[PDB]
User: Which sequence fits this backbone?
């Protein structure tokens, strides 16, 4: 589902950025936009959808629509990667183009294998 | 009560409705009201556009698009309530309770009762305004819900120097229609039409992409000194005539995806 | 540095102990007597019985009004002799008396409908047994009220048991175990007889009856002595929840209380009235205060034949005394307030009540408001349910969609482009008379009345998302629907 | 004048019902009940009866408002005798309610002259022994939606309240507001034993003129304030006497469409709420031409204007769905099926003969979802929105075939049938020939 993987994200983030600087906040999207006024520092995230293919694209769509709800605080950046196994045109029309428009904006592309170029 | 109207282009109906509904004195405000709409209409744009029209009225803002369930709303609410209180009454003393102490609306009610019995000593009474944008758009939503949030003026004692009010925003109308038996005020926004969305875009995105770089790029990639910003807006304008004369057929009376595809294919 | 993955701070942990009594003497020889003990056998609850008396006390008094009937209402209220149910008295009191003479572990089960005097008769049996404790010739023993319904978690039986036999506080998984330790492991010569009675077990043990299993497992000793009872409504429960081997091996005694006979009913309700029956009062001239043996001296009475019919109607259905008594009180109410309405006193030589108004009180209980309501609605709901019955006439389906009924509706209308009532409600329903307004596929107020009836309970809507193919059902009847239908002058003819 | 503005406010709070407890208005068409229940309450306030009772009426019918009103009347001479308890079953539970009981019981006892501490069973037995076991103070509960407490098995608190009514010495007043009619049906035996079963209903409107004099009353002034008070009264009376008034016709409308007032008040408010000067008030309530704007923009965007604003592509494909669903058994349909019949329609159109362009599968990929998101289609074995929690919970556990199978072949479903649209549309269209199977 959506909510669980969100809780995973926030648990990772807070238990990561706490001990590096030495009270509790719940696990929600408020916390990220509330990062400034607990620890003082700004933050930059990076997202790795590990096995990008074998997952509920609906839940995915829900999630990424949730995640676009935090580009209004002028103090944060993030980035996503898809670690793909098949192909873009296989799945860039499997998911709703609502998601895909902005995903036309600023992307990057690699050929990726064990045997690169002999 | 003197209310400055927002002299808007396209919603002076709902402007009339809500600037009539609401003023500083709570008595001439209803107990619970909806502002349903549809996306892109700037319902959320125009609410704050009205708060621009009226500064001395204040409201809290929540966005449960990101929240998932009921308890997280409780927690965020219990935070923002007393946050807003003490931020705007600085001189007042307090015993600031934990917002995470809430785990159930009863507990929210209890701690608000405590907020009030500590805020007992005010000079005049005050009603404030709560905002839940997309309360239909929740992600584990069930149907046992909206009646409860109606019932918050229910259990509050009547001797409250500090009261509150509720605000909503929905889409479908199906689960709205499920519940209108409670004889509720409501204000609404029809999906726009082609000259309407046209003029909304020529007034909204005009300054944006008139003041994006690629103009300033191209003018001097070409190196041509015959120019004025009238014609800049003009060529942008007829370009967008072309855009919409193409893809009105594709979409109709929306803005968001048009903005996307503009950003992509503009350059 | 660490973070808890989820918080519980609104917890209210209870200060109750996990060490049973089994581990505060540490030997058979190491134990004192509970009878030679101030804290055991409950010599301290009385203070918390009286600590809270004063919390709600006042002395405000301004222009007290007091009238005729109310004293008789409270003569007639359930909060107080009875010879009607006395052979069960003469049998169970015999059994319990012989039981405490035997000092054995006897067990008994009773059931009965709500309104049988079960709790009454039993509470009075044991009050007589209290006076038998006031004989000071029988071994003293102690009562235990068990209202699991006035308990939350049905293992709290053990908890409260220990916190009332000892006043000591633990969790069930210490308390019941310390209690088995208290029961079989303990000899007789200082352990006390206790009597206990369980109330309404139908909801107490809903999961698997491991609680009550534990109970009835405690009830099978020869070194421990107890007096156990329970109450229910169904009868198969001892063999239903257990099975047959357990309920059979225990070998208890079973009974249930039934509806009383109309004569006993009248006998008793008047037995709660003979202090006031046919009495005469001195009565002031302004407030009408009825004061007893500028003032009259008049008589009071009530319809005896009305007692006959009133008991007679409800003796045949259940035998619920409470129902009889409320019927009495409400008849008195309508009499009194009509009387007051005669003179119109304000707010700051015979008086008698009738069979007419006794039955007026007794009948409206059965006279349903739904019919007058559904007749007094608007036209639309009537029209629509009539269309439903039209479909039920066309197919005999017992169920209908939304699309099919709406098709029936439009047909039922456009057929009748000739009736006048439908001629005159014609244009003012889709676009409401005027121009500037485009048509709509459905009528106004159809969603309103839909939900209205859903809230009413007559209409049943399954769970789907489509507006058209959602199946729909009516809840009541078609006959009564016609008893609303033809009552409209215009509907009977179409 | 701002005397008139204050008068706006005056009549507005009179429209609400937000007045002192002498001007709060009640009408003869419910005075039988009003004079019933003021008496039903003061019998336990001051005469110390322990009456049990359950109101019945549907929503928006002024039940709780009237408990509030009678007790608010009672306050002015009785600041002491009673204690108010408001509650609700959706808001509360079988569990979180009792803590609210302790809370209020503790925190209004202070207002005149511990409880809330402990566990669930502990504070339970604390309230029990306080209530179970010179003058006593009277107690009044105001349940709301006891339906929640009308569950199948336990609902023990209700039994315990009514046993408290019978057994106790305090006046235990219990009111129940709900919306269902047959409430006694829900119960098990012990409730029907302990409860009085005396249960009250509300009146309906039995004629137009009732609503007429109600309008008159609620638009009649009972105090001299402003230079247009008598003007207001006389205008009201002379317009409302006319059966030819628009507003009488809307009175008819409520009498036949809905038969219920609070929606009407909702409609009535904006009239004054916008009202700015007096000639505008006059002409506007004369013509009621702005009721037209109101009720045109009221339910404007439900079924029709939403289909009034869409592209022709949507229409073509919807037709391609309609006629083939008609051809079908269950009316089921898919993406490429509609695409096929669509192109057939265009072939027919271009065969009978400025020109026409058809829209590639990429071009349909977008707007098919603009369609599914506007409630015209659904899925075959679909189920829309669960009612309670555990269903919403299991939903996000178990996904759908439609979630796993791709976009274009999941078995859809339809909202409108062809001939509806055939009659509905403007028949002048270039496609009107194509709206018939
Ligand atoms: N009356 C108006 N005047 C000027 N601009 C408008 C008006 N209505 C809408 N817009 C433009 O359209 C945009 C829509 O923004 P917004 O997200 O608030 O729409 P929405 O319907 O509230 O969306 P959501 O469904 O997310 O609430 C606004 O940001 C604004 O630029
Ligand atoms: N023979 C009688 N004499 C006097 N009063 C009676 C008699 N029979 C019934 N009553 C009245 O009717 C009521 C019957 O109470 P009963 O003992 O049947 O309660 P109950 O059935 O245990 O209730 P529940 O089934 O809800 O536990 C009593 O309160 C009493 O006032
Ligand atoms: N404090 C108040 N001030 C003014 N008017 C009120 C107030 N409370 C209720 N009302 C009016 O009474 C009506 C609702 O009353 P009430 O709740 O008794 O109806 P209901 O049918 O009982 O609804 P529910 O069953 O949900 O309680 C509304 O039309 C409202 O305007
Ligand atoms: Mg918005
Ligand atoms: Mg009993
Ligand atoms: Mg109510």
Assistant:
């Amino acid at each position: 589902n959506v909510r669980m993987m969100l809780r995973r994200s926030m648990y990772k983030l807070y238990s990561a950025a706490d001990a590096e600087e030495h009270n509790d906040v719940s696990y929600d999207l408020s916390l990220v936009e509330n990062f400034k006024r607990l620890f003082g520092k700004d933050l930059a995230m990076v997202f790795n959808f590990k096995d990008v293919d074998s997952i509920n694209f609906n839940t995915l769509d829900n999630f990424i629509i949730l995640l676009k709800s935090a580009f209004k605080y002028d103090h944060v950046k993030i980035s996503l990667i898809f670690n793909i196994n098949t192909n873009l045109s296989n799945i860039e029309k499997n998911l709703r183009q609502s998601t895909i428009r902005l995903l036309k904006r600023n992307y990057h592309k690699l050929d990726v294998s064990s045997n690169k170029g002999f | 009560m003197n209310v400055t109207t927002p002299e808007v282009a396209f919603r002076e109906y709902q402007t009339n409705c809500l600037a009539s509904y609401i003023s500083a004195d709570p008595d001439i405000t209803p107990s619970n009201l909806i502002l349903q709409g549809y996306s892109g209409t700037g319902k959320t744009y125009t609410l704050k556009k009205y708060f621009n029209a009226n500064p001395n009225l204040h409201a809290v803002w929540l966005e449960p698009v990101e929240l998932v369930s009921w308890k997280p709303l409780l927690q965020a609410i219990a935070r923002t309530v007393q946050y807003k209180l003490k931020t705007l009454y600085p001189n007042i003393p307090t015993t600031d309770y934990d917002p995470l102490q809430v785990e159930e609306p009863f507990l929210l009610v209890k701690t608000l009762h405590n907020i009030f019995v500590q805020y007992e000593s005010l000079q005049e009474k005050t009603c404030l305004f709560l905002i839940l944008d997309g309360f239909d758009s929740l992600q584990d939503l069930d149907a046992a819900l909206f009646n409860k949030y109606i019932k918050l003026n229910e259990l509050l004692p009547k001797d409250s120097k500090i009261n509150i009010k509720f605000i909503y925003t929905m889409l479908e109308t199906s689960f709205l229609q499920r519940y209108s038996t409670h004889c509720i005020p409501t204000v609404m926004f029809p999906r726009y039409n082609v000259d309407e969305v046209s003029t909304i875009l020529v007034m909204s995105r005009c300054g944006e992409l008139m003041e994006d770089s690629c103009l300033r790029k191209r003018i001097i990639e070409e190196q041509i000194t015959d120019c004025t910003d009238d014609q800049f807006q003009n060529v942008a304008a007829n370009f967008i005539h072309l855009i919409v004369q193409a893809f009105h057929s594709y979409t109709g009376n929306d803005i968001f995806a048009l903005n996307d595809l503009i950003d992509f294919k503009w350059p | 540095p660490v973070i808890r993955k989820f918080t519980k701070k609104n917890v209210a942990r209870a200060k109750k102990k996990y060490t049973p009594f089994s581990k505060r003497f540490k030997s058979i020889a190491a134990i004192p007597d509970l009878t030679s003990l101030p804290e055991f056998y409950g010599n301290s609850s009385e203070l918390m019985a009286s600590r809270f008396e004063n919390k709600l006390k006042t002395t405000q008094k301004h222009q007290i009004v007091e009238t005729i009937f109310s004293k008789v209402k409270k003569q007639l209220n359930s909060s107080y002799y009875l010879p009607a149910r006395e052979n069960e008295f003469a049998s169970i009191y015999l059994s319990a008396y012989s039981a405490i003479e035997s000092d054995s572990a006897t067990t008994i089960y009773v059931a009965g409908t709500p309104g049988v005097g079960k709790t009454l008769t039993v509470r009075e049996v044991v009050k007589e047994l209290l006076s038998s404790s006031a004989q000071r010739e029988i071994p003293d023993f102690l009562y235990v009220e068990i209202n699991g319904l006035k308990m939350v978690k049905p293992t709290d039986c053990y908890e409260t048991l220990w916190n009332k036999v000892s006043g000591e506080r633990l969790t069930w998984a210490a308390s019941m175990e310390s209690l088995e330790f208290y029961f079989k492991r303990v000899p007789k010569n200082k352990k006390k007889t206790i009597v206990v009675l369980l109330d309404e077990l139908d909801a107490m043990v809903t999961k698997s009856q491991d609680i009550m299993y534990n109970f009835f497992n405690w009830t099978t000793y020869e070194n421990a002595k107890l007096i156990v009872i329970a109450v229910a409504n169904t009868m198969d429960l001892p063999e239903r929840q257990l099975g047959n081997k357990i309920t059979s091996r225990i070998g208890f005694t079973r009974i249930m209380f039934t509806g009383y006979t109309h004569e006993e009913l009248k006998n008793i309700i008047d037995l709660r009235l003979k202090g006031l029956n046919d009495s005469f009062f001195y009565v002031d001239t302004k407030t009408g205060n009825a004061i007893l043996i500028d003032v009259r001296k008049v008589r009071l009475r009530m319809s005896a034949d009305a007692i006959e019919i009133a008991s007679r109607k409800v003796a045949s259905v259940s035998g619920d005394a409470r129902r009889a008594l409320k019927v009495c009180k409400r008849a008195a109410e309508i009499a009194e307030k009509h009387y007051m309405a005669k003179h119109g006193y304000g707010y700051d030589g015979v008086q008698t009540v009738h069979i007419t108004h006794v039955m007026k009180a007794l009948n409206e209980t059965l006279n349903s408001h739904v019919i007058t309501f559904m007749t007094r609605l608007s036209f639309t709901a009537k029209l629509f349910i009539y269309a439903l019955l039209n479909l039920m006439k066309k197919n005999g389906s017992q169920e209908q969609e939304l699309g099919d009924i709406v098709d029936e509706i439009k047909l039922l209308i456009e057929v009748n482009g000739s009736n006048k009532f439908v001629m005159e409600i014609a244009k003012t329903l889709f676009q409401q008379g005027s121009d500037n307004i485009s048509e709509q596929l459905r009528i106004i107020s159809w969603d309103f009345v839909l939900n209205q009836l859903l809230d009413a309970g007559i209409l049943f809507k399954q769970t789907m998302k489509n507006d058209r193919i959602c199946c729909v059902k009516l809840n009541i009847s078609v006959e009564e629907a016609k008893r609303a239908m033809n009552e409209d002058e215009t509907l009977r003819n179409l | 004048d701002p005397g008139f503005g204050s008068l706006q406010r005056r009549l507005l709070q009179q429209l609400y019902g937000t007045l002192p407890t002498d001007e709060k208005i009640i009408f003869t068409y419910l005075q039988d009940c009003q004079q019933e229940i003021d008496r039903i309450i003061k019998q336990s306030i001051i005469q110390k009866e322990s009456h049990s009772v359950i109101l019945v009426g549907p929503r928006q019918s002024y039940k709780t408002y009237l408990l509030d009103y009678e007790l608010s009347l009672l306050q002015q001479s009785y600041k002491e005798q009673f204690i108010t308890i408001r509650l609700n079953g959706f808001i509360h539970s079988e569990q979180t309610a009792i803590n609210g009981i302790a809370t209020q019981l503790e925190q209004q006892l202070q207002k005149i002259h511990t409880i809330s501490s402990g566990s669930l069973t502990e504070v339970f037995e604390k309230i029990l022994l306080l209530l179970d076991s010179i003058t006593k103070i009277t107690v009044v509960f105001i349940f709301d939606e006891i339906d929640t407490f009308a569950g199948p098995v336990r609902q023990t608190l209700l039994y315990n309240l009514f046993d408290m009514v019978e057994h106790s010495r305090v006046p235990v007043c219990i009111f129940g507001c709900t919306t269902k009619l047959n409430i006694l049906e829900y119960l098990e035996k012990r409730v029907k034993s302990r409860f009085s079963q005396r249960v009250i209903y509300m009146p309906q409107i039995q004629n137009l003129d009732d609503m007429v004099d109600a309008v008159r009353n609620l638009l009649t002034v009972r105090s001299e304030i402003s230079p247009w008070v008598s003007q207001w009264n006389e205008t009201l009376e002379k317009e409302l006497s006319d059966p030819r008034s628009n507003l009488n016709r809307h009175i008819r409308m409520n009498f036949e469409t809905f038969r219920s007032l609070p929606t009407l008040k909702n409609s009535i408010i904006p009239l004054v709420a916008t009202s700015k000067n007096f000639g505008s008030l006059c002409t506007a309530i004369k013509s009621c031409s702005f009721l037209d704007i109101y009720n045109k923009n009221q339910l404007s965007n439900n079924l029709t204007g939403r289909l009034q604003s869409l592209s022709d592509l949507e229409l073509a494909i919807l037709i391609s769905a309609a006629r083939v669903a008609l051809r079908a058994k269950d009316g089921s349909f898919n993406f490429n099926l509609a695409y096929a019949e669509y192109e057939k329609m265009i072939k027919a159109i271009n065969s009978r003969i400025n020109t026409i362009k058809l829209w590639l599968k990429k071009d349909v990929k977008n707007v098919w979802e603009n369609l599914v998101q506007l409630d015209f289609f659904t899925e075959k074995s679909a189920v829309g929105l669960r009612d309670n929690a555990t269903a919403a919970f299991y939903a996000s556990n178990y996904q759908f075939q439609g979630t796993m199978i791709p976009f274009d072949l999941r078995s859809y479903q339809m909202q409108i049938i062809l001939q509806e649209l055939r009659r509905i549309i403007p028949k002048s269209n270039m496609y009107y020939s194509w709206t018939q199977l």
In short: The pocket of adenosine-5'-triphosphate (ligand 1) is lined by residues B 8-11, 37, 39-46, 169, 200, 203-204, 255 (CB under 6 Å). Strands of chain B lie at 34-35, 126-129, 132-133, 162-165, 168-169, 186-187.
